[PDB]
Design a protein around this nucleic acid. Structure first.
Ligand SMILES: [Ca+2]
Length: 744
RNA sequence: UUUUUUUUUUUU
């Protein structure tokens, strides 16, 4: 058939005028047409696809009609650099925009992409580190185009998919784009990708910067731009060949630095507040490192009882009502004692002066202890400059730094990226799901330490997720290692949900894991701490912190359905429960039930017993078991580490011998936050890949006619069985004969 | 009453 191939070649040539998503499926579908024998059938299937191609070809033409007017406000400094960047984007595959806080590049960058003509044949993805950053930026570009969000400009987050068929700009969290990679590895949905706030150097951000480097050869038609602050924009250019950089000014008033080093710590803060009161009676933002540190400074400043003041705290876990109190109205004098939330996420309003002690809690993975550590460290130069920048908003400000300039200049320029200091267990799991087994070959922007990667590989083996196909360093995951990839939860938690089906507890396991994936919805406010406890202690199980979630879950589900929507938000307030988190605890549970149902795992309708729910949970907590010390309230855990039970635990008063905790974190000691009693008999059937068997005192016993010994099974060093006499002859007959021969 | 409290966040 040569005329049939003319209708074939002419059709593909037309197919270049379609959306990239459509252009792929039709091109494959045509390549399977000549496979059919009958040419009479072919002429019937070209005619149909051309009818479907015609709809798709018209789809883009209709789409171009919905392109709106392009408007750039003259307030923003980026509107001046607009002509410089626009030329750079069309001419270069990769462009990098870095600007100060005032620039307004974030809102106007999607507009320049549209002015270039992108967004019609394929979507333009814009990625933000937090949800609200994705949501507010979308709502802002809609405002500036006299359209409403979800239309031309849309945003997708974990539970809101506000996108339409005429959408051209897609705001989203960086993790959303990652979830889309398994389904669409070539990212054919998008015509251009803009990555914003890349200076934060998140684990997702760093992984995206690698994956995009890998597909650029297979996606020449797409162009990509990465955006950040003026902090190390040359790393990004080096990553993508030598990509062009464009810098934009910011609208901020000048800030002055005053280095004043050195209860000696608390006294230094007093002198700083006294100095600021002389020069002006303005707001002071004092960065604080912890709830205990914010509580000690708050009691100190309120103890002085300054006449015209208000001591107002702000931290991440604070009540959404009490947190949003800072964003109301300035009256009298306000000094806000805040933590990192005021450095990146929140941006506290009405600030004139900022006091920087230069200390912050940073999360680190100790590949010695294999435990998450939260030390209080000196912050980086960039972190101090970010704190310094949170004070110049509307009027001229000054920033006082409570340390010497030589200390500041001695500090690293930038904080360590997250990929370098967290466990890569889930990271490598998702990589193996995509076929990216060789982690050394993956083009990281900052490659992690080799020993750090292997810790993740070991944890996956601990969960049964990974194996190698007798290769050197390219892994292939197991059938449940792929199911662990399908659940959007921590690998430890995903593993217990899978093991949950062998026992009658999939509902309970989904409740537990969902709760452990959020900040604790139960709130313990700074005032009425004991009052909060009596309200929270209604559901405490005598020996299981995990079961407390189940009781609380059934309670809230029953009260949500029994009374109104407004009366429920009140019941959340009167029981010290964050409504939004209680809501999200349900949304994760609902998402789990989807994939759990989609994988065919049956979910129970009956309540389960204590042993089955917790045996299922133990599957993800094998490194998190401990044995109590005799006549001591301390625990010996995995390896030779020692941890104490968290004080807010239902079994803190009466700690059993054998425990499992959900989380081990080291601050001053090693704390096991969510804990429950376990029987050591349970640990052996699940740790077959981990147990180490040692045999001792071998002797020949006449009655049974075999050699006997005392065996001690050991997981991560812990004696699950201290000793039990067993016939050594069945265990290793050759060795027993050799001992019998040598008379021993 | 024998141990008295943990930075910021993202999704398949
Ligand atoms: Ca929609």
């Amino acid at each position: 058939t040569e005329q049939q191939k003319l209708t074939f070649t002419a059709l593909q040539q037309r197919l270049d005028s379609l959306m990239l998503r459509d252009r792929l499926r039709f091109s494959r579908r045509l390549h399977g047409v000549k496979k059919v024998k009958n040419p009479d059938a072919q002429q019937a299937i070209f005619q149909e696809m051309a009818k479907e191609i015609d709809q798709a070809a018209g789809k883009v033409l209709l789409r171009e009609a919905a392109r709106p007017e392009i408007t750039y406000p003259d307030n923003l400094p980026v509107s001046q650099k607009k002509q410089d960047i626009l030329e750079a984007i069309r001419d270069h595959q990769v462009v990098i925009v870095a600007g100060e806080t005032g620039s307004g590049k974030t809102t106007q960058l999607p507009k320049i992409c549209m002015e270039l003509g992108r967004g019609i044949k394929g979507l333009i993805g814009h990625t933000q580190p937090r949800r609200l950053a994705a949501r507010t930026v979308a709502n802002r570009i809609a405002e500036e185009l006299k359209t409403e969000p979800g239309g031309c400009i849309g945003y997708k987050v974990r539970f809101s998919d506000h996108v339409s068929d005429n959408t051209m700009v897609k705001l989203m969290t960086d993790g959303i784009l990652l979830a889309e990679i398994q389904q669409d590895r070539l990212l054919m949905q998008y015509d251009t990708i803009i990555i914003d706030e890349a200076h934060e150097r998140s684990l997702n951000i760093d992984f995206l910067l690698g994956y995009l480097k890998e597909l650029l050869p297979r996606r020449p038609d797409l162009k990509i731009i990465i955006t950040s602050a003026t902090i190390d924009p040359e790393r990004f250019s080096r990553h993508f060949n030598n990509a062009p950089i464009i810098e934009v000014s910011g609208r901020t008033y000048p800030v002055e630095v005053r280095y004043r080093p050195i209860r000696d710590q608390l006294q230094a803060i007093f002198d700083a507040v006294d100095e600021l009161s002389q020069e002006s009676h303005g707001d002071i933002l004092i960065f604080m490192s912890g709830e205990r540190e914010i509580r000690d400074t708050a009691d100190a400043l309120n103890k002085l009882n300054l006449r015209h003041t208000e001591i107002l705290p702000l931290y991440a876990r604070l009540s959404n009502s009490e947190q949003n109190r800072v964003f109301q109205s300035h009256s009298g004098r306000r000094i806000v004692l805040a933590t990192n939330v005021a450095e990146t996420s929140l941006t506290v309003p009405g600030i004139k002066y900022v006091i920087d002690p230069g200390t912050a809690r940073i999360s680190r993975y100790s590949y010695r202890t294999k435990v998450q550590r939260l030390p209080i460290e000196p912050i980086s130069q960039a972190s101090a400059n970010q704190r310094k920048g949170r004070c110049g908003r509307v009027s001229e400000g000054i920033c006082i730094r409570l340390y010497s300039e030589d200390d500041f200049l001695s500090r690293p320029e930038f904080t360590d990226p997250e990929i370098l200091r967290t466990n890569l267990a889930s990271v490598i799991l998702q990589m193996t799901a995509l076929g990216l087994g060789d982690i050394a070959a993956f083009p990281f922007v900052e490659a992690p330490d080799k020993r750090n990667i292997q810790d993740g590989v070991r944890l996956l083996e601990e969960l049964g997720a990974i194996t190698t196909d007798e290769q050197a360093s390219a892994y292939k995951l197991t059938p449940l290692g792929r199911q662990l990839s399908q659940l959007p939860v921590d690998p430890r938690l995903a593993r217990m949900v899978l093991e949950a089906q062998k026992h009658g507890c999939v509902r309970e396991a989904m409740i537990i894991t969902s709760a452990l994936s959020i900040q604790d919805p139960r709130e313990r406010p700074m005032d009425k701490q004991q009052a909060s406890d009596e309200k929270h202690r209604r559901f405490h199980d005598k020996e299981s912190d995990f079961l407390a979630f189940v009781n609380l879950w059934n309670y809230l589900g029953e009260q949500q359905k029994a009374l109104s929507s407004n009366a429920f938000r009140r019941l959340c307030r009167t029981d010290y429960l964050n409504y939004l988190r209680v809501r999200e605890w349900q949304d994760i549970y609902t998402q789990l039930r989807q994939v759990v149902k989609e994988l065919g795992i049956p979910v129970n309708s009956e309540p389960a017993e204590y042993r089955e729910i917790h045996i299922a949970l133990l599957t993800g907590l094998l490194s998190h078991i401990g044995m109590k010390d005799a006549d001591k309230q301390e625990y010996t855990g995995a390896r030779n580490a020692r941890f104490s039970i968290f004080p807010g635990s239902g079994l803190f008063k009466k700690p059993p011998k054998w425990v499992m905790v959900a989380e081990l974190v080291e601050t001053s000691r090693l704390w096991g936050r969510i804990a429950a009693r376990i029987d050591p008999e349970w640990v052996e059937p699940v740790a077959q890949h981990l147990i180490k068997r040692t045999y001792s005192e071998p002797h020949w016993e006449r009655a049974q006619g075999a050699v006997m010994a005392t065996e001690k099974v050991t997981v991560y060093g812990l004696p699950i069985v201290a000793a039990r006499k067993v016939n050594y002859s069945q265990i290793d007959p050759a060795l027993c004969r050799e001992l019998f021969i040598r008379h021993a």
